[PDB]
Amino acid sequence: QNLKSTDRAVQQMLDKAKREGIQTVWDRYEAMKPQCGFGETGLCCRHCLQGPCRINPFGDEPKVGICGATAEVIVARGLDRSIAAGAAGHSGHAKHLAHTLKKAVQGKAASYMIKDRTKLHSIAKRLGIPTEGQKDEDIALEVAKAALADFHEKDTPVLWVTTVLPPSRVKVLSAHGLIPAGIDHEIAEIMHRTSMGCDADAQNLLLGGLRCSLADLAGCYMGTDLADILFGTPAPVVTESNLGVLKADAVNVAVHGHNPVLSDIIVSVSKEMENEARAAGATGINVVGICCTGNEVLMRHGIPACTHSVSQEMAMITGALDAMILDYQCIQPSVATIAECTGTTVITTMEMSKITGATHVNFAEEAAVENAKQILRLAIDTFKRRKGKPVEIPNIKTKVVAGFSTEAIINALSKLNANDPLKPLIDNVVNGNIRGVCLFAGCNNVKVPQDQNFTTIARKLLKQNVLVVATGCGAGALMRHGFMDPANVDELCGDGLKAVLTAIGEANGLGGPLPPVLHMGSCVDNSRAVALVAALANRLGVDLDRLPVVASAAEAMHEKAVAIGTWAVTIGLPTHIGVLPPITGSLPVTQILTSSVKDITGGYFIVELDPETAADKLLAAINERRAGLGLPW
Amino acid sequence: QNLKSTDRAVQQMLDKAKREGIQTVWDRYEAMKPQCGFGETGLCCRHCLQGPCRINPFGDEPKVGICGATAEVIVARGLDRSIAAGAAGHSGHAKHLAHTLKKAVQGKAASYMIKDRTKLHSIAKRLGIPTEGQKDEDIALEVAKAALADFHEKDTPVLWVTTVLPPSRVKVLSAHGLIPAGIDHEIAEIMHRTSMGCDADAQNLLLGGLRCSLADLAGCYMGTDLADILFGTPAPVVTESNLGVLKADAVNVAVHGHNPVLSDIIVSVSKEMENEARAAGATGINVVGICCTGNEVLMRHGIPACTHSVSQEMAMITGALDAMILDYQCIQPSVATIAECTGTTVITTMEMSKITGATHVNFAEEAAVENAKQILRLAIDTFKRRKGKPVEIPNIKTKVVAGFSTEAIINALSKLNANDPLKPLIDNVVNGNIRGVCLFAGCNNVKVPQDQNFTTIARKLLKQNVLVVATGCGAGALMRHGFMDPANVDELCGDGLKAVLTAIGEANGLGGPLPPVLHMGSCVDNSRAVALVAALANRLGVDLDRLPVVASAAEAMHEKAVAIGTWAVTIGLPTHIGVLPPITGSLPVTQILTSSVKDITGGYFIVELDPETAADKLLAAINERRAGLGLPW
Ligand code: SF4
Ligand code: SF4
Ligand code: F3S
Ligand code: F3S
Ligand code: FES
Ligand code: FES
Ligand SMILES: [Fe+3]
Ligand SMILES: [Fe+3]
Ligand code: NI
Ligand code: NI
C-alpha cells in the first residue's frame, strides 16, 4: 500500500477498505488506466457540438481541429478555462465572506462579528478607506462593499491586486495589460475568448490566462483578509495531525471543504453542546479538520487535522467518523456512497454544492448557531448508533506547530529586530544561513504516491538551508510527516537553517527552534506568502522576480492549483509543478510557460515529475536568483 | 458535394477548393472520423489533473470518475460549462455595447449616438428609469449603467430577465430559484460548482444551468436593446443573399463575427470611401455579411449576406474577397491560413480575439471612423493586387425580405387592427389559419449536410400552416434557399398561412404577401422572439408554456446555441435540437432535459437528428399546446 500512500495511517485504512470491499480513489484510478493520451497532453477540444476534436501528438491526421484550431490554440484554451474555474472557486469563497461581513455589521447575522479590529483597520488603510472618526461597523461595511466591487468593472482595477503588490510589479503587469478589471469579469472573458471561433493565438490566449490568474490571486487575498477580520488573524498554535486524532469515545465530526463561515461556527457551537453529547454517552464533540476548512480552524483554534486531499475517504473507514460537514470544493463525491458502508452522516450545507445521497441542511449565516446545532445533533444521533461497535483508528499522529500568518512571522522576527523585523531574515539570506525560500502549495494527486513529492523535495531543500513555508494540502502532507514538529529540526535542517530557526525560537521564549516548516494556512492563504514576499521586495527596493523565492505545487490536482501556480509565475516566481498539466501536446505553449514568460513577468513554470530532479531544479532557480543579487551560493 | 452542403454556391466553391488543394472544414471533419465516443456521449471529464477520466457508456470499468463523479454528474457538469460559455459570449457582446453607449453619451465616442430615441425611452420605461424632464443623454446614461449593473449582484435581480418576461413566468422561475442574481456572477458560480469536489447532484447542477441560461437570455436581450438604441430598430427591408452578392469589379469586404459596434461603422465609412475605391480602379466598396454581424447590418441597412456558419471559408475561395473584418465568435480560425492561398486580407480588431497570421488593427470606439478607414484602405490595397486575376463568384443569389423586429411585426399586424395589433395573429391561431409558431435558431454543423435540417423541417411546418420565424444562421439557411422571398409563398405555404401572410402584406401596401419566413435578426435577436411571445402570453393572460410556440436549433454548433436552447426550455417552450448534445451517456440527465423539466418550467428538449421525424415531433408539440387551449388541431 506504500505505492498508494506514504502515510502509515492511510496505509492501515487502505488495508481495511480492501478487506471490507470498499472501493477507494486509488481503486477508481486503477480502473481508469490507461488514461486517454489526448486528454493527458491537452490535445482534445469539446468547445462546440462539431466535436469532440483531437489532435495526434505525433504521426498523421487528425492534425488540426474541425474549425481549424491548432494544437497551440486547443492547449491554451483548455488551460485558460482551468484557470478561470480556479478563480471562480476563489473568489466565490471570497464573495461568500464579503456577504457575511456585510450582514454581520448590518445586524443581520449576530453569530458573526469583527473579531480582529487591527486587521480591519489595516485593510481599510491599504484600500484607502478612511478610518478616523468612523464607527468600526461603518469601516467594515466599506471594506465589504469594496470587496464586492472588485468582482465587476468600475473606475479602478481590482484593488485586491493593485494594493497588494509593490508599484514596480504593478507597473510591469500593467505594461502587458495583465491587471484584472474585475474578478468575475475576467472569468467571463476567459469563457468567451476560449469559446469557438474567438481567440486563436497562443500568446494572446496565455496573456489572458495570466490576467485571470491575478483575478484568482485577488480572490485568495480577499478571502484571507475577510476571514481574518471575522475569525481572527492566526498566531502560533500547537496541535496534532493524522487519523489518530479521532477518539472512539467522542462524537467525531469532520469539517471538510473550504469556508470558515461554516467551520468556525461548528467549532464554537460544538463546545456549547458538550453536555448534550455527554448525555448521549460520549465524552464530548471532537471536531477534526479535513482539507482547507480544516486548515482554517487548525490555524485559528488549534483544531487537529485528521487528513487531507486524496486520502479523505480513509477517515470514514475507521468507523469512528460520526459526521462529515461539507460546504464546497475538493470533496470526493464518493464520500456519499462510502457513508452508507461506514455509518458516517455526510451533510451538505451550501445550495450550489449538493451530493446525491448526502443529507442537506441549509446553513444560513442569519441562523448559523441554530443550523449548527441541527447538524451536530445528527452527529450525536450517529454516535449513538455505533454504541458497542469496534472501530479501527490508527494510533498515529504527529505534533504540529502552525499559525504562521505573515503578521505572526513578522512578530517572531521582531524579537530579533523590533523596528526592522524583516532585516534578520534578509541578513541570514545574505550570509547564507538561509539559502532562499520555498512555498509548498496545493493538493495531493492519486497519480503520485501520497506525500512522496512534498517530503522528498522538502528534505533536500531543508538540508540546503532553504526556509520552507507551506499551505493547503502541502502543509497537510508535511505536517503528517513531522515537518511541523520542532523536535525534528536537528534531523531535517541544515546547520545554517537550524541556527536561524533556533535564534528566532529562543528569542520568542520557546527554549527551542521554530518548526522545520512554517504553516501559513489554507490555499487562499497562499496570499499570506504573497504579502511576505511583497514586503521583502519592498524592503529591499527590488521586484519579486529578483528574490530567491520559489514555489512548488508538487502534487497538484485542482483547477485552483493551476490558477495559483499561474499567478505565482505572473508575480515573478519560479514555480514547480510535480504533475503534468495538459500542455505537452503543444511545444509552443510549453515553451511560453516554461521559458518565454520569463521575459514578460520574470517567473516561469518548472514541470518536473521526478522529485529529486525537481529539488535540484528548484535549488538551481534559488541559486540563480542569489547570483543575480551578487550573493554567494 | 451534396452530401456536404445543400447550397449550390457552396458546392461550386467546394469543387474549386478541392482542385486547388485548399483544405476545408468538411475535409477537417473527415480527418477527425471516427470521433471519440466518450466525448460524443458526454462521458469524459478533465476538470482536474487526476484526469482525464471517462466512463464506458456500456460494459465494464471504468464506471465512475476517479473522485467518485458519476456519469450523471460528469454529463451535467460538462453541459453547465457549455451554458456558461455561451452566456459569456453574450453577454460580453452586450457589455461591449453598454460601454459604447455610455461613451457615446459622455462625449467620448462621437461616431456613435442615440439613433432610436423611441427605443431608448421605451427601454427606460420598462426598467423603471424616469424620463420626464430628463435629457436624452442622461436617460441613456442611466440605461447603460443599469445594463452594466446587471452583470453583478445588487439589491435587485437581473432586470433584463425580470422586466422582459411576464410576472407569472417570473413567479414560476423564482419559486425554483432560477432568477439570475447577476450575469457574470452566474457564469462564475457555474465554473465554481462544476469544478472538482463541488456540486455532485444532477438535478441541482441542471437547475444551476437553467439559471445560467437566463443570464444568457439577459445578455441577448440587452444586446438587442442597446444595438437598437445605437443603430436603429429594424424595419422591413429588401436585399439579397449568397455568394453571388460578391462583385468582381468592386472591393469586396466581408463583416464577420458579431458586434454591430464594428460592422455598423464599416458600413457607413465604406460609403464615404467610394471615390477612394474608384481611384484604385474599383466601382466602389461592396460590404457583405457573414454570420451574425452580417445579420445585424442586413436587418438595419439591407447589406447583402454572403454566407453563414459552416460555409464561411467558401467566400474566400471565390478569389474576390478582398478583406474579412473580424471581431469575435464563430470565426473558423482556418480563415487566417486560407487567406494566404486566396489573397484575402483577414483583419482582427478586438484585443481578446486574435488569430495567428491575421493582421490586427485595434478598433477603438473613440477612433472608430479613423480605424475603419485604416481597415478599408488595406482592403483597397488588396483589390489592387488582384487586378487581372480571374475570380469564380457563383452567379447564385436569392431575394431576401427581412427586418422583422418585434416592433415591425406589431406594426404590420396593426394595419389589420390598429389598437389591438396582436389580435389578428391570435384570431388566426384560433381559426386554424396559423397552426402555431416555430422559431428556427442557431448554427450550421459540419455533421449535418448544410441547411438540410432547416429546410426539411421548415417545408413540413409551412405546409401545415405554421408561422415560421428565424434568426442567426437558421435565418441564413432559410434565406439562401428562398424562404425569405414572397414569390415563394404559393409553393411553400399551406392555404391558411398563405391567406394570413397575404392579408397582412396587402394591408401593408405590398400588393403581395409577407415572405414565407420572418427574419427576426441575429442570435442575440432571439430576444425579439421572446418579446413577441411574452407579449402574446400577456395579451392572452396565460403563461408561455400554454402557447403553441416551439423552437428548433436544427443544426446547432456553438456553446451559445446550447445556452439559447436551454433558456428556450426555461421560459416554457418545446425546443428541438437537431444534433446530439453530449448528454446521451446519462439517461437520468437526458430524462430531466427531455421530460421531467416539463414539471419545472413547462418547456422541454426534443432531441431528434432525423429532420422529417423532428418536424412531426414539433407539430405534435404545437398540437398538444392547441389542445390544451381547447382549440381544434
Ligand atoms: S471549437 Fe473547433 S476544435 Fe473545438 S470542438 Fe469545436 S470544431 Fe472542434
Ligand atoms: S473532477 Fe473527478 S472525474 Fe473529473 S478529472 Fe478530476 S477525478 Fe476525474
Ligand atoms: S483543499 Fe483542495 S485545492 Fe488542493 S490543496 Fe487540498 S485538495
Ligand atoms: S453566428 Fe455563430 S452562434 Fe451559430 S447562429 Fe451562426 S454559427
Ligand atoms: S479524446 Fe480523450 S480527453 Fe477527449
Ligand atoms: S476520452 Fe475522448 S473526449 Fe475525453
Ligand atoms: Fe483547498
Ligand atoms: Fe451568431
Ligand atoms: Ni489547494
Ligand atoms: Ni447563433
Short mmCIF file of C-alpha atoms and ligand atoms in Angstrom, two decimals, chain A residues 35-40 43-46 52-54, chain B residues 35-39 44-46 52-54, ligand 5:
data_model
loop_
_atom_site.label_atom_id
_atom_site.label_comp_id
_atom_site.label_asym_id
_atom_site.label_seq_id
_atom_site.Cartn_x
_atom_site.Cartn_y
_atom_site.Cartn_z
CA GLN A 35 -5.96 7.12 -19.36
CA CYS A 36 -6.64 8.93 -22.63
CA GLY A 37 -3.45 10.25 -24.21
CA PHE A 38 -5.28 13.08 -25.98
CA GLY A 39 -6.59 14.39 -22.67
CA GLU A 40 -3.24 13.84 -20.94
CA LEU A 43 -4.93 17.68 -27.46
CA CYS A 44 -8.71 17.40 -27.11
CA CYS A 45 -11.41 20.02 -27.55
CA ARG A 46 -15.14 19.83 -26.79
CA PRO A 52 -15.12 16.11 -29.89
CA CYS A 53 -11.94 17.06 -31.70
CA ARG A 54 -8.49 15.66 -31.03
CA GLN B 35 -14.73 10.84 -33.30
CA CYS B 36 -14.29 9.88 -29.66
CA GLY B 37 -17.35 8.08 -28.29
CA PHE B 38 -16.67 9.25 -24.73
CA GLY B 39 -16.78 12.88 -25.82
CA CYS B 44 -15.39 12.40 -20.25
CA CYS B 45 -14.12 14.78 -17.57
CA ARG B 46 -10.94 16.87 -17.49
CA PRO B 52 -8.66 12.62 -17.95
CA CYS B 53 -11.50 10.46 -16.68
CA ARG B 54 -14.01 8.60 -18.81
S1 FES C 5 -10.30 12.14 -26.82
FE1 FES C 5 -9.88 11.57 -24.60
S2 FES C 5 -9.94 13.53 -23.47
FE2 FES C 5 -11.06 13.83 -25.48
#
